[PDB]
C-alpha cells in the first residue's frame with residue numbers, strides 16, 4: 100500500500116494524533132476512513148509505543164460493534180491507518196443534539212456495547228475508557244467502539260494505572276486499588292445513565308466532590324427513568340467489582356430484551 | 368449522489384476485507400517509525 104492507491108474524497112475531522120479523511124481504495128472501489136499521522140510529531144510527543152499498543156489491539160479485533168482497522172502502511176513522513184468508515188459519525192454529537200436518548204436507542208446501544216466488550220474480555224482486553232466521545236455510528240446507527248487509547252491486553256488481569264475520564268472513573272481507580280476487566284462494567288453503567296439522562300451520574304462542580312460521589316456511589320435517579328433502566332444501571336454501578344452485573348447479564352437484562360432494536364450488519 | 372448510494376451498497380454487499388486487505392503484507396510495528 101501507498102497513498103496513491105486511494106482517492107481522498109473529503110476530510111472527516113481532526114483525531115487525537117492526526118487528521119482523518121474519507122477515502123476510496125482504487126483497486127476494489129471500497130470506501131473507508133484514512134487516519135494520517137506524522138512520524139516526527141508522534142516521536143516529539145513521545146507517543147510511539149502508545150500508538151504501537153493501540154494498533155496492536157485494534158488491528159486484531161473483528162466484531163460488528165468495534166471499528167475495524169483493515170490494515171496500515173507508512174511512507175517517508177507519515178503513518179496511515181486504514182479504518183472502517185462509520186457513516187453516521189460521532190455518537191457524542193448525536194447525544195448533544197437530542198439532549199438524551201429514548202429507551203429504545205439507549206437499550207440498543209447497551210446491547211451492542213455489552214456484546215463488543217464481551218468479545219474484548221474473552222480475549223483479556225480491557226477497554227478502560229468507555230464514554231460517548233469514543234463511539235461512532237454505522238450505516239444503520241450501530242454503535243462502533245472506535246478509540247483504544249487506554250486499552251490493555253492483561254493476561255494476569257490485575258492493573259494499577261489510573262485511567263479514563265473523570266466522570267467515568269470506577270471507585271477502585273480513585274482509591275488506588277488494583278483493577279481488572281470489571282472497570283468496563285462500571286463504565287457501561289455510567290454510559291447507560293448518561294444516554295438516558297444526558298448527564299453523567301456523579302456530575303459535580305469540583306474533581307474532589309466528583310471523586311467523593313463516585314466512591315460513595317451517590318446515585319440519584321431522575322424521576323422520568325423507567326424501573327427497568329434504573330435496575331440495569333444499579334446492577335452495573337456497584338462499589339464492589341465482583342458484584343457488578345456481567346456483560347452477558349446486560350445482554351440478557353429484561354429492559355434490554357424489551358427495548359433493544361439491535362440489527363447485526365450483513366456479513367460476507 | 369453516487370457516493371451515498373455506494374455507502375448503502377457497501378452495507379448490503381460487504382466484501383471479504385480479511386482476504387482483500389488482511390492477507391496483504393503489513394509493515395512490522397517496530398518498523399513504523401523507521402525508513403519506508
Ligand SMILES: CC(C)NC(=O)[C@H]1CCC[C@H]1Nc1nc(Nc2ccc(C(=O)N(C)C3CCN(C)CC3)cc2)ncc1C(F)(F)F
Nearest residue numbers: 111112113114119132182183184185186187188233245246
Ligand atoms: C476517536 C473517535 C472515535 N472519533 C474519531 O476518530 C473522529 C476523528 C475525526 C473523524 C472521526 N473518525 C471517524 N469518523 C468516521 N465517520 C464520520 C465522521 C464525521 C462525520 C460528520 O462529519 N458528520 C456526521 C456531520 C456532517 C455535517 N456536519 C455539518 C456535522 C457533522 C461523518 C462520518 N468514520 C471513521 C472514523 C475513524 F475512526 F476511522 F477515523
